[PDB]
Design a protein around this ligand. Structure first.
Ligand code: HEM
Ligand SMILES: CCCCCCCC
Length: 478
């Protein structure tokens, strides 16, 4: 009883705050869940976006109500203020990545953010360029054999194994050994975790913790959680043991990679992390550092396939930059200006993270006079934001030149936020951008990509942006 009364009072509170915001009709039980759970609901939200300027309410089951926002001023008003993440959504992370940097709020988040930000300084990243090329070459060898077999194949999983391996070699001290059967067990568990958690987000019956853990869904989730934790436990043990080597420990001790910072080599961290805190940050970054870039690369190579003229331009840019070099140098990534424009245009139409959430700790007033109070829930729809017609002429049209120096000089700084923005932006953005430029550059020099008209990708939200049917492409070796 006590709890049910509070539940209805919040229900009425959240609803009243959004009364100045008209929105689509709500089912009496599911709210908007039934539209959201359909294939294509990202595009149905885009249509709601045209019917309701700026923002519109959004309900999952008549108890939780978000304000879906999709206009730059509205995005800027919230995502510049470092309000906490929406606990109704991010609490589902807890059995999986825990209270790591993505879930933390408040001054503990800033401590860890201060702690981990040196791990992604460009001097730490320069050596990673060589690792990116090695791991890509391993993937491209597999691909030259499949290609000569004549059938189209899904590239997503191969890109993921490659991304996972390159993430661990770069930021977790993995040695030259490479992928092992156990690494694929981790990869498969993330699929299950992001599948199930995305469905929990859209399924209000699964919201209550007590109930969820009794369902087959929740038990499946907790089996996957343990599988992920077995992986991160080994990676941690392995690096503590490897630092017991005299040669190795002397060597590490100017700039430290991600996992060594956490392990507080050289004592300089100035913060003491619990084992819980440590594993949560490893869980968090092991996930965020490969799931996202897998989506980005895979969707990019799809966009290059859809648009061979752009693909050929990118192929010629990177070919001139490489010359007779054995491999690209960190300095070369800046010259890939046109590849970067296509990559941004890809992320506009195919954002690797299409939706994020906040819970306002303070009120906010928007550019049109409407406002919201503290305690309300914000749903940043990056997908619709990037297709906003008031901001992007011909939104569905792929045009890399949208991101030329001239055409972006007066860009609203919150129009194109695939890595978010404000204090809770992506810590890994330049790690990711660098990885993806090196991988896709080598991909284009080695293969020419075309789509499969029989198996065109369908967009599938899954925390990051996946495909219902993979990304099946045809490859020509060169
Ligand atoms: C294509 C690449 C990437 C995309 C699209 C992406 C997207 C995002 C987004 C949208 C956020 C905000 C989270 C929210 O609003 O809830 C974010 C934050 C973050 N990303 Fe990424 N990310 C990328 C690459 C990376 C990489 C490479 C790593 C790890 C090495 C990573 C780790 C994280 C973490 C830990 C945060 C939280 C930072 C904080 O709260 O201070 N991301 N990312
Ligand atoms: C609720 C969706 C958030 C996904 C964040 C992923 C961070 C890279």
């Amino acid at each position: 009883f006590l709890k049910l009364l509070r539940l209805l009072l919040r229900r009425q509170r959240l609803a009243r705050a959004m009364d100045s915001f008209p929105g689509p009709p709500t089912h009496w039980l599911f709210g908007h869940a039934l539209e959201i759970q359909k294939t294509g609901s990202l595009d149905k939200v885009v249509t709601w976006t045209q019917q309701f300027p700026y923002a519109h309410p959004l309900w999952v089951g008549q108890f939780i109500g978000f304000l879906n926002i999709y206009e730059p001023d509205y995005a800027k008003a919230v995502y510049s203020r470092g309000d906490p993440k929406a606990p109704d959504v991010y609490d589902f992370f807890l059995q999986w990545i825990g209270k790591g940097l993505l879930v933390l709020d408040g001054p503990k988040w800033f401590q860890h953010r201060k702690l981990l930000t040196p791990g992604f300084h460009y001097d730490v990243l320069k050596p990673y360029v060589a690792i990116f090329a090695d791991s890509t070459r391993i993937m491209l060898e597999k691909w030259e054999k499949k290609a000569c077999e004549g059938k189209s194949f899904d590239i997503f999983s191969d890109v993921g194994h490659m991304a996972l391996d390159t993430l661990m070699k770069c930021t977790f001290g993995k040695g030259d050994s490479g992928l092992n059967h156990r690494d694929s067990s981790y990869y498969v568990a993330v699929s299950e975790l992001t599948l199930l958690m995305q469905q929990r987000i859209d399924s209000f019956q699964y919201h209550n913790d007590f109930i969820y853990w009794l369902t087959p869904h929740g038990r499946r989730f907790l089996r996957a959680c343990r599988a992920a934790h077995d992986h991160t436990d080994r990676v941690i043990r392995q690096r503590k043991a490897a630092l017991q080597d005299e040669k190795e420990r002397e060597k590490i001790q100017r700039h430290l990679d991600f996992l060594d910072i956490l392990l507080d080599v050289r004592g300089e961290s100035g913060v003491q992390l619990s084992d819980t805190d440590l594993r949560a940050e490893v869980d968090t970054f092991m996930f965020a550092g490969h799931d996202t870039t897998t989506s980005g690369i895979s969707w990019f190579l799809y966009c290059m396939a859809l648009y061979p003229e752009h693909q050929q331009r990118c192929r010629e840019e990177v070919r001139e930059i490489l010359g007779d070099q054995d491999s690209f140098q960190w300095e070369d990534l800046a010259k890939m200006t046109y590849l970067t424009m296509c990559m941004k245009e890809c992320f506009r139409l195919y954002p690797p993270v299409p939706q994020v959430y906040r819970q306002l700790s303070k009120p906010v007033s928007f550019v049109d006079g409407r406002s919201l109070p503290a305690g309300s829930l914000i749903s940043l729809h990056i997908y619709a934001l990037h297709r906003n017609s008031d901001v992007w002429p011909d939104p569905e049209v792929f045009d890399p030149l949208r991101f030329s120096p001239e055409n972006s000089s007066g860009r609203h700084p919150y129009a194109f936020i695939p890595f978010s923005a404000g204090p809770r932006n992506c810590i890994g953005q330049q790690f990711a951008m660098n990885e993806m430029k090196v991988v896709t550059a080598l991909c284009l020099l080695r293969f020419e990509f075309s789509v499969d008209p029989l198996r065109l990708p369908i967009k599938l939200p899954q925390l990051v942006l996946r495909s219902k049917n993979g990304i099946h492409l045809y490859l020509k070796p060169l």
